[PDB]
Design an enzyme around this catalytic site. Structure first.
Site, PDB file in Angstrom:
ATOM      1  NE  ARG A  48      -7.052   0.517  52.741  1.00  0.00           N
ATOM      2  CZ  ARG A  48      -8.363   0.375  52.556  1.00  0.00           C
ATOM      3  NH1 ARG A  48      -9.002   1.120  51.652  1.00  0.00           N
ATOM      4  NH2 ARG A  48      -9.046  -0.493  53.301  1.00  0.00           N
ATOM      5  CE  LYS A  91      -5.015  -6.081  55.506  1.00  0.00           C
ATOM      6  NZ  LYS A  91      -4.113  -6.531  54.394  1.00  0.00           N
TER       7      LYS A  91
END
Ligand SMILES: C=C[C@@]1(C)CC(=O)[C@]2(O)[C@@]3(C)[C@@H](O)CCC(C)(C)[C@@H]3[C@H](O)[C@H](OC(=O)CCCCN3CCN(C)CC3)[C@@]2(C)O1
Ligand SMILES: C=C[C@@]1(C)CC(=O)[C@]2(O)[C@@]3(C)[C@@H](O)CCC(C)(C)[C@@H]3[C@H](O)[C@H](OC(=O)CCCCN3CCN(C)CC3)[C@@]2(C)O1
Ligand SMILES: Nc1nc2c(ncn2[C@@H]2O[C@H](COP(=O)(O)OP(=O)(O)OP(O)(O)=S)[C@@H](O)[C@H]2O)c(=O)[nH]1
Ligand SMILES: Nc1nc2c(ncn2[C@@H]2O[C@H](COP(=O)(O)OP(=O)(O)OP(O)(O)=S)[C@@H](O)[C@H]2O)c(=O)[nH]1
Ligand SMILES: [Mg+2]
Ligand SMILES: [Mg+2]
Lengths: 190, 339, 189, 190, 189, 339
Positions: free
Chosen positions: E141, E177
């Site tokens: 990420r 997430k």
């Protein structure tokens, strides 16, 4: 008053905060014209505003496809928990009606929490009535960590409901990091 | 109800002495817990000794022991420095004390402005045999000396001749200054605290910014603050004892850190203490006048500054000056009550 | 409610505010915090009264995010896009002033985009003016995926800003929910 | 060979590319230990590798919870479309078995497309067999724009299936921007 | 397969490559494109043979994203984290060399993170070594939400890098997430 | 099969003349479409006229019309400049021509190096009455002059005495250079194209980089390219006609853009054309030698450079030099076929 601008805000306890989003809102926006979208939206929200007055929730704001209100305002009520649940019921039926008309698969996702808030207005220009606190934050995360077509509630919202509604394990700790990390026991209304 | 109370905010740089003032207020006006604070006193003793030995080598020129033997005690101290839950075994005190007796260690202590050393050092080290006792009970002067850093905002309540006080304690270090705001509204008066003695020292936060200078800059920020236009400042020029000792010692000169002190001649209205050296007078007043230049240059009779030469560890000096203020605080909560 | 062709939308948010937000007895359960936010949002509203920002229309604040648009008071051409940017810089300066006095360090995170929107009123109760459109969602994402002390703009918005005399640097690519991936830029100072 | 490093890649037509992700994979990772997660994962994928050999799909790689293979490799087959669908069937049942064991709601999302690819290896070190082309890209977007517990296929994948399987409108253009913007007619297997 | 306590993972991707990718008759339906990618990935593999990068373990390439880790050949302390960074800079230099000769301008986008992982083999067919863990997802990420020509690192990774002599700047906050929001930094040159 | 064919890659800066060479190959070796290209010729005519008028005012010193009357025709031209689908009405040609007759307009044309103007300007403007005809059919020389920018890679096939050729055309402007790579592998030989005449001009891309300099820098990149170590370059020093005209005109001197030309004396092996001015010889050879310095300084008998003075618009000069190359290309596809 003198050195800090006067604040138009006040604390309130024993309120219940509802948050709702439109499931599959983006796929709906894919299908229709930019204009037709605003009318389906504008119309659905005009309907929600009615249910609000009936169910005794004070509507706060509309942020895109995110709608939120709170019962227990302006003046204190005992039913504050039942109202929001009731509003949540209505919202879920209402959306399924406009789901027919469009023929697309949209649905509402609800999240509720109970506690204190601060309500009022900020700044000078374009005043819009609003609510702020960790409880409001939690409620939003409740919506976010919610489940399609279901009313996602908390611990605090169950102790004001007097078990009139029947629930089940909510498992919100696995749909939202904030719910996980804060050890929040969530439930789903049947 | 809310108006019959005086909300006091203690502001000032880190280690200036704010927490000590609140302590004195408990000694003075407030009605089993002394047990817990012994741990923290033992911690100050430890931190003090290990800081001086560590510094010995890192100074320039470095500092040697007076007795080569003590090298092993130096190793001992350095070896248990970062230990989590330290036992404070009987040996620790013997090693620690022996080191403090070493003349070359004290030589390094005298140069402590050249590194970061807690204030309660000499005080505690001088009474190791008192502190090691397992039946040991901290005197009041020990609690006043015990150094614990403040992080957050802590409210203390008291009453004086049925007059109410709400005192607010805050962290004075940079990261902490961001919390101060939450007390600015509804404040009756500011009590700004300053370490007068620290003219020869730099702040922890960067090991470069002069502590007195940082205090001046911080005072300026508060004085000319946009949310503090109405609020008057009670300026405590703290650590008057340490200041005097440094002045008489004549080791490090003030003129070397603040060249303007060279221009300074002592004021007319100066009211020296009984048997106070003229140079001590000259010094402490100089330090006061540096802060008065800041307050004079703005404010427009909208708020005021009231200086006081103080010493927070001295309960007697504090009872006196706090009574000096009880006067003005009444008068101040009255100006804002009308306008 | 009507539609427009070229409205410049801006979201300016303060990421570090939520951290600052606390509830305790000392700060009246988070009220002293909101008090500061009030001083900030109000300090931002003061800018709207500057003659050079008379084209700027404040839409609302979302939490601690300021939302405003240029070109609603419309029917040389793209001069309102540059205005929106001057406004962002304006906000940064105001926020720096707050820092001076609050002993804090809030940084502003900005996203600007331009294009067709639909302005108007919504809701039955207290009818309130909002604008809708892909143009607005994208501006929102420019903020949410942006960097502190940076103004993030879309490619076309970038193109125009260059005709006006600003330079831009490609941030890279960003995935928009519903619009796929897309290339972005940061404005230079 | 001489000025460019030798490439170990070759074009292949008439192949069908399958992509699968784990629906609700993150909620599963919330429940179990870091280790237990790797075993459920490692075990499920060991099972998938079997189905691959049976169904005649060549497994390509495992990227986290994303699994993908392709029938028609190494050597050309007519059944290439039917194989991937079949593999897709098996994968969806297999995952529901481990869904019992864990008791969590995980499921597979499949996406398939047919066309040409380039297959081989890149660079010098740590060679791993791979496939590349716009068709591979489309297939991945098919998985991404797929639907839970369903096999999402394309136009091209229907003209190789000889209508042996029964489908329905797929509506992939509204679940993925790439599918929208490229005007891709998607379908769902019944 | 076993577990580790402090492995430094890095994803370096080339956002602008997919745009470059084309299929036509002229470039052998996209093969001349992959040919260039081969020269790039191979040029990156050459770095592993440098004595200073003997701690670097290439894990795989995902599309045009290079994935590598330091500290698998383990059991002063955090010196392998700095190594991973030196490696990222190394990649940038190689990529610049490619640009010179390909008349292109690919920029590298990097994300580094450190922490506990589980290394090992997976799959029945051709058993291949992969590492798993939150530590690895987060690194991913850092890349995917990163900026061109920038190395994005987590807060702790940031902390350590400073003890080693690098400075970092807060990018802002990022929503992961499953892990919620989190603060990030860009390394400085 | 694949080896009996010669894959040629035309490289070079924007507008150097690459696309023209491919055109000549169709004229020369390749077996209704002339209708479509008339539109594009009319476009060149338009772009040419409007570029010269626009420049008149923006130059320093600016340029006035010779006849104040023509001001209205200037307005006319400027008013329809950015028009989408332009009609090319009868008036356009009258206004355009009148302007081209104006002596003050031609004055501005002579200073065209000071702005960006297409090559086919004077050629087309001189035959407006030919081009306006609605039964007009473009000559071959017109198709060679017609300027259309290339973006992408375009393959052309031909055969010469049963020998096969695959020619690749590419964009020479900066944004386009990134596509070149896709032809580097499997290339038989490079034909690098250069605008010899553009020594007094800057590139479009930034309006600052000298066109000849950009060509040198680009040549260096190709010559010392890591993927082109084996590959030999056939250097076409194009636009020899325009060069000569500029040299004889004596208006802008080469020594002013490339001071090294001041040192230059003409070579021994120089083989001047029949009736070629010694200064033209000196100039064209100088330009060649600038490129030879680059190729000489590296390559190590691994690849080679073969120069040719060329003119792409001249079908005769091209048939000749292309035959000159058919020779070497055979020999080159042989070196790489063995090693
Ligand atoms: C001001 C303090 C603090 C901490 C407390 C609070 O109640 C908030 O104002 C709420 C929660 C609250 O006002 C309800 C509306 C909204 C918009 C939900 C606010 C934001 O999330 C704020 O934070 C932000 O400004 C950042 C998040 C905003 C993004 N939201 C998330 C939810 N969707 C549905 C709309 C956009 C907030 C959290 O900030
Ligand atoms: C090399 C050229 C080109 C254009 C063509 C291609 O087939 C790809 O290599 C695939 C598609 C292909 O190799 C299948 C694996 C994967 C990983 C899907 C590649 C990436 O998406 C590539 O792009 C990237 O490197 C960026 C996207 C990578 C992110 N993926 C998306 C899918 N999830 C499931 C895993 C991570 C790719 C698209 O790039
Ligand atoms: N000699 C002497 N020591 C003093 C005096 N006032 C305070 N101290 C000492 O200074 C030390 C630090 O004072 P303290 O009260 O902790 O400062 P502070 O301003 O609260 O520090 P912080 O919370 O901002 S980090 C204490 O341990 C106390 O011994 C004084 O006037 N004289
Ligand atoms: N006088 C003259 N004009 C020439 C010559 N060679 C080419 N031209 C002209 O130059 C113009 C541009 O040449 P062109 O072939 O388009 O260059 P290019 O290299 O293909 O340009 P690009 O595709 O990289 S932008 C043409 O319109 C043609 O008239 C020559 O030798 N003499
Ligand atoms: Mg303190
Ligand atoms: Mg061309």
């Amino acid at each position: 008053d003198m050195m800090f601008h006067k604040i138009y805000i006040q604390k309130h306890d024993n309120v219940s905060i509802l948050f709702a989003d439109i499931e599959g809102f983006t796929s709906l926006a894919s299908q229709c014209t930019a204009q037709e979208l605003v009318m389906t939206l504008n119309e659905l929200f005009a309907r929600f505003d009615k249910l609000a007055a009936e169910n005794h929730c004070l509507r706060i704001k509309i942020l895109g496809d995110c709608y939120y209100c709170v019962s227990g305002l302006p003046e204190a009520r005992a039913d504050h928990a039942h109202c929001c649940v009731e509003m949540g019921m209505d919202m879920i039926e209402a959306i399924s009606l406009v789901r027919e008309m469009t023929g697309v698969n949209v649905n509402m996702r609800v999240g509720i929490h109970s506690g204190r808030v601060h309500c009022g207005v900020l700044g000078l220009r374009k005043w819009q009535f609003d609510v702020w606190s960790n409880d409001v934050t939690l409620a939003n995360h409740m919506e976010a960590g919610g489940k399609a077509g279901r009313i996602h509630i908390t611990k605090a919202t169950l102790s004001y409901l007097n078990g009139d509604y029947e629930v089940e394990p909510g498992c919100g700790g696995e749909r939202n990091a904030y719910l996980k990390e804060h050890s929040i026991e969530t439930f789903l209304i049947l | 109800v809310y108006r019959a109370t005086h909300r006091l905010l203690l502001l000032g740089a880190g280690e200036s002495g704010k927490s000590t003032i609140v302590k004195q207020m408990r000694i003075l006006h407030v009605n089993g817990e002394k047990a817990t604070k012994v741990q923290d006193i033992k911690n100050n003793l430890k931190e003090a000794i290990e800081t001086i030995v560590a510094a010995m080598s890192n100074l320039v020129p470095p500092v040697e022991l007076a007795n080569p033997e003590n090298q092993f005690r130096v190793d001992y101290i350095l070896s248990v420095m970062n230990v989590p839950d330290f036992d404070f075994p009987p040996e620790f005190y013997e090693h620690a004390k022996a080191l403090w007796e070493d003349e070359g260690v004290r030589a390094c202590y005298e140069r402590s402005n050249e590194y970061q050393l807690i204030d309660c050092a000499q005080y505690f080290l001088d009474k190791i045999d008192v502190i090691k006792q397992d039946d040991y009970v901290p005197s009041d002067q020990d609690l006043l000396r015990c150094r614990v850093l403040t992080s957050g905002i802590f409210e203390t309540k008291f009453q004086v001749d049925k007059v109410n006080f709400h005192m607010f304690d805050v962290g004075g270090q940079r990261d902490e200054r961001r919390k101060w705001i939450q007390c600015f509204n509804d404040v009756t008066a500011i009590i700004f605290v300053v370490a007068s003695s620290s003219y020869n020292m730099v702040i922890r936060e960067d090991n470069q910014t002069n502590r007195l200078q940082e205090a001046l800059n911080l005072f300026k920020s508060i004085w000319n603050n946009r949310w503090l236009r109405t609020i008057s400042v009670i300026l405590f020029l703290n650590k008057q004892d340490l200041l005097a000792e440094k002045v008489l010692a004549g080791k490090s000169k003030i003129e070397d850190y603040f060249p303007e002190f060279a221009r300074y001649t002592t004021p007319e209205d100066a009211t020296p203490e009984p048997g106070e050296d003229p140079r001590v007078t000259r010094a402490k007043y100089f330090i006061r006048d540096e802060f008065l230049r800041i307050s004079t240059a703005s404010g427009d009779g909208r708020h005021y500054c009231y200086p006081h030469f103080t010493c927070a560890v001295d309960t007697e000096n504090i009872r006196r000056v706090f009574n000096d203020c009880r006067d003005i605080i009444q008068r101040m909560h009255l100006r804002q009550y009308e306008l | 409610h009507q539609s427009y062709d070229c409205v410049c939308v801006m979201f300016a948010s303060i990421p570090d505010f939520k951290e600052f937000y606390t509830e305790s007895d000392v700060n009246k359960e988070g009220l002293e915090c909101l008090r500061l936010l009030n001083e900030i949002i109000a300090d931002f509203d003061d800018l709207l009264s500057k003659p050079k920002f008379s084209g700027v229309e404040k839409i609302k604040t979302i939490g601690s995010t300021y939302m405003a648009a240029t070109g609603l008071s419309a029917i040389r051409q793209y001069m309102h896009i540059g205005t929106m940017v001057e406004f962002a810089y304006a906000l940064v300066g105001k926020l720096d002033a707050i820092n001076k006095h609050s002993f804090n360090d809030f940084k502003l995170r900005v996203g600007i985009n331009h294009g067709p929107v639909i302005a108007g009123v919504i809701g039955a109760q207290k009818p309130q003016y909002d604008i809708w459109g892909n143009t607005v969602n994208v501006a929102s994402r420019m903020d949410s995926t942006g960097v502190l002390d940076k103004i993030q703009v879309t490619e076309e918005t970038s193109l125009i800003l260059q005709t006006l005399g600003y330079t831009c640097t490609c941030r890279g690519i960003i995935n928009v929910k519903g619009k796929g991936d897309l290339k972005t830029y940061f404005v230079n100072t």
